[PDB]
Amino acid sequence: SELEKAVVALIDVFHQYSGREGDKHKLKKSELKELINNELSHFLEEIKEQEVVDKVMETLDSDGDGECDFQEFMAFVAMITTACHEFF
Amino acid sequence: SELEKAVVALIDVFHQYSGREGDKHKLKKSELKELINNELSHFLEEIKEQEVVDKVMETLDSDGDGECDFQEFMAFVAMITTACHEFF
Numbered sequence: 787s788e789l790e791k792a793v794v795a796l797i798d799v800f801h802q803y804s805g806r807e808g809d810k811h812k813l814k815k816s817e818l819k820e821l822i823n824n825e826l827s828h829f830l831e832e833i834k835e836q837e838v839v840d841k842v843m844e845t846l847d848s849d850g851d852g853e854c855d856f857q858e859f860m861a862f863v864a865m866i867t868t869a870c871h872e873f874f
Numbered sequence: 875s876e877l878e879k880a881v882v883a884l885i886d887v888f889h890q891y892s893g894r895e896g897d898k899h900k901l902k903k904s905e906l907k908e909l910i911n912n913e914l915s916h917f918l919e920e921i922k923e924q925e926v927v928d929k930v931m932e933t934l935d936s937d938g939d940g941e942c943d944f945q946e947f948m949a950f951v952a953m954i955t956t957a958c959h960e961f962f
């Protein structure tokens with residue numbers, strides 16, 4: 787189904803970026819940026835400034851370890867989905 | 875992108891079922907059941923007993939109004955995605 791395809795897409799895209807550098811199960815600043823710029827180009831403005839990268843990570847980093855884990859990525863997805871939902 | 879397609883799939887499948895009966899922005903017991911049975915047939919066991927329907931709603935119903943709204947649906951999706959993530 788389309789729902790099951792959406793579940794596996796969330797897992798795959800996270801790992802496409804998290805496993806690039808350092809901890810393979812977390813997104814660092816540069817990995818989060820590329821994910822937003824390449825995969826969310828219709829929902830979000832392209833990030834071109836360092837302070838936007840820093841602010842976005844600050845917002846998503848719930849436990850405060852400097853990176854975005856899978857749970858925090860899921861919360862980010864929930865935010866975008868809710869913002870898009872309320873648009874209509 | 876695949877991620878953006880996943881975001882719109884979550885919104886669409888929720889409304890496919892929530893808008894069937896009663897409140898068009900919330901899932902009642904029978905609507906939640908059909909969503910699980912039709913759209914999550916590879917991730918979850920088919921619900922065939924009433925007490926399984928009742929228990930699942932009890933688990934998902936965070937604010938305690940008897941139904942599953944969009945925020946609660948997103949938390950449900952997060953649960954399944956995390957369970958599938960940890961499987962590998």
Ligand SMILES: CN1CCN(c2ccccc2C/N=N\C(N)=S)CC1
Pocket residue numbers: 827828829830831866869870873
């Ligand atoms: C600069 N933009 C271009 C992408 N946009 C957008 C694009 C398509 C459909 C809906 C939205 C609307 N709204 N919100 C989100 N995507 S979070 C708006 C922001």
Ligand SMILES: CN1CCN(c2ccccc2C/N=N\C(N)=S)CC1
Pocket residue numbers: 915916917918919954957958961
């Ligand atoms: C009775 N089942 C059939 C569907 N399953 C399943 C199917 C495919 C890939 C991974 C899982 C594994 N694990 N978890 C979830 N889907 S939440 C297991 C449960």
Ligand SMILES: C[As](C)(=O)[O-]
Pocket residue numbers: 805806807
């Ligand atoms: C850790 As690699 C070689 O997939 O960027």
Ligand SMILES: C[As](C)(=O)[O-]
Pocket residue numbers: 893894895
């Ligand atoms: C409320 As209807 C007619 O789409 O089931």
Ligand SMILES: [Ca+2]
Pocket residue numbers: 803804805806807808809810811812813814817
């Ligand atoms: Ca990483």
Ligand SMILES: [Ca+2]
Pocket residue numbers: 846847848849850851852853854855858
């Ligand atoms: Ca973190």
Ligand SMILES: [Ca+2]
Pocket residue numbers: 891892893894895896897898899900901902905
């Ligand atoms: Ca309803």
Ligand SMILES: [Ca+2]
Pocket residue numbers: 934935936937938939940941942943946
């Ligand atoms: Ca509720």
